[PDB]
């Protein structure tokens, strides 16, 4: 003679664009209830790339297409007539690397610091590594350890270039969520 | 461009009695596709205290209130013009002890091989111990270890019974699920 939200869960790997379903109903059949949905303790409401379906023993939540911004805590309260209840589930929304500076080829003179962009987004926030083809075929590539610094947002830094440091670099970006981001640039340098 | 079903799950500790749920919808929103229930691999169709909705983008299975027969692998296909695909969950439906045959108390005679029946139903299979008062107030209960036998049926056999037999004696049936069924008796041994 109780009340008692039965859990919901959302799926593991939800990313950008994907859908979003929840189903709130009850563990004993009442058949003397009302639903209501809520993120974050603040009440979601039927419109908006997020709709809300109510039926008599069920209702369900619908987020589709999910962003970025639809992660949070969700929760569904049951009233039947005397008493509520409540089940709340975390949603987190993921996504694979996307291009914000994309590196380019370069050309400076010999003995200047340059940095070579390579700056994405994506949750979780990417990894970001570097590597030289060290043979100018390009098809062999190489981790980077004296003048190359990797600065933590993904830029590389080659200070006092010479011409030993030209070559082809390629900034690899994943996060473990969908395809890794990769681009390949030529550095040239030149005596003024 | 592909058709994943979205996984579904049944809730943990399902008991016979209650209701269970399970939605049926894309990874993707595709608006092109229909549903197909199946119980281990044989088609579910709506009637029989299990009924099947169907709707634009998902579907939801309903089964209230559930039985122990209602235990296996539950499948839905989803089929958009051209692919189809499925996603099984697997629902086990438990339940708390039930009696089956109650313990009696009994009035036997010295030297006599008597049994003590306490067998119970319940998923999981309940387990079953016995415990003497060996007091008659009858507060205090001990574990029982030479001429005391439990079967593994959960049946007491007290073997050359005498005086010292006598006292109160309780089963006790668990299987971690709900309450457990606990009874005592009296046993009395007389001479002829
Ligand atoms: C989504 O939910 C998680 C945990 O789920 C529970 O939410 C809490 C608040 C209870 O309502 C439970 O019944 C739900 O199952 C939240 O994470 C918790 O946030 C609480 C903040 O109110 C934390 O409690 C605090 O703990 C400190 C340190 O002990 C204490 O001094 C405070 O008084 C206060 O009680 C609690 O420890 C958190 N637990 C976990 C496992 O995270 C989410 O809120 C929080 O998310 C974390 C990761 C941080 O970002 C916090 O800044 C944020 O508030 C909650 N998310 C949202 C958006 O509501
Ligand atoms: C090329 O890079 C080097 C070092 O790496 C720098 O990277 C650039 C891109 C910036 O992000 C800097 O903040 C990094 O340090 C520069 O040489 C460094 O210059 C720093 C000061 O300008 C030195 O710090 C000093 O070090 C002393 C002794 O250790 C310390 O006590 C002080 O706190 C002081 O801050 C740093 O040590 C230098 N690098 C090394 C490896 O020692 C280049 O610029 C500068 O070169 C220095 C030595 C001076 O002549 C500056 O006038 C000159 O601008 C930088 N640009 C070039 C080479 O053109
Ligand atoms: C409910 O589902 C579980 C596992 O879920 C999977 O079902 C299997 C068959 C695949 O379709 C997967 O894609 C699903 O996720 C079943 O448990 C499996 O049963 C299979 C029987 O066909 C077993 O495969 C066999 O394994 C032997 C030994 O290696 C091999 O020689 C055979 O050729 C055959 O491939 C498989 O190993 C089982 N795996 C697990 C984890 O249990 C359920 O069926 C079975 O349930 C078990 C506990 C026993 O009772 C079996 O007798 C029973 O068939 C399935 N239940 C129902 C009712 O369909
Ligand atoms: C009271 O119980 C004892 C022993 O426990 C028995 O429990 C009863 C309820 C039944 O489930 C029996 O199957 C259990 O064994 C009985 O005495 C046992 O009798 C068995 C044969 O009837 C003996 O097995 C034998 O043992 C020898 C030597 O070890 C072996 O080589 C053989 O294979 C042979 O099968 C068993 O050993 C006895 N118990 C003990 C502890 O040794 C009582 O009944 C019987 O007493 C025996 C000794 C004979 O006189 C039978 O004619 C008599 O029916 C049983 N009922 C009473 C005491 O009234």
Redesign the interface.
Same mark, same amino acid.
């Given at each position: 003679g109780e009340l008692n939200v039965?859990?919901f #869960?959302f799926?593991?790997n939800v990313m950008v664009?994907?859908?979003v379903?929840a189903?709130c109903?009850? #563990?004993?059949?009442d058949a003397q209830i009302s639903f209501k949905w809520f993120k974050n303790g603040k009440q979601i409401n039927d419109n908006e790339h997020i709709k809300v379906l109510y039926y008599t023993?069920?209702s369900?939540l619908?987020i589709?297409?999910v962003k970025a911004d639809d992660s949070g805590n969700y929760t569904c309260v049951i009233t039947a007539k005397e008493k509520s209840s409540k089940f709340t589930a975390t949603l987190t929304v993921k996504a694979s690397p996307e291009w914000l500076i994309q590196p380019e080829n370069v050309e400076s003179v010999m003995g200047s610091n340059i940095s070579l962009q390579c700056s994405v987004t994506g949750i979780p926030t990417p990894t970001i590594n570097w590597k030289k083809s060290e043979t100018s075929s390009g098809t062999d590539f190489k981790s980077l350890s004296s003048n190359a610094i990797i600065l933590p947002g993904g830029t590389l830094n080659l200070l006092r270039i010479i011409k030993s440091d030209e070559g082809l670099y390629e900034c690899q970006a994943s996060n473990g969520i969908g395809n890794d981001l990769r681009k390949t640039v030529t550095i040239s340098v030149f005596i003024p």
């Open positions: 039965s859990p #869960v799926r593991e664009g994907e859908k379903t189903t109903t009850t #563990v004993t059949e023993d069920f369900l619908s589709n297409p």
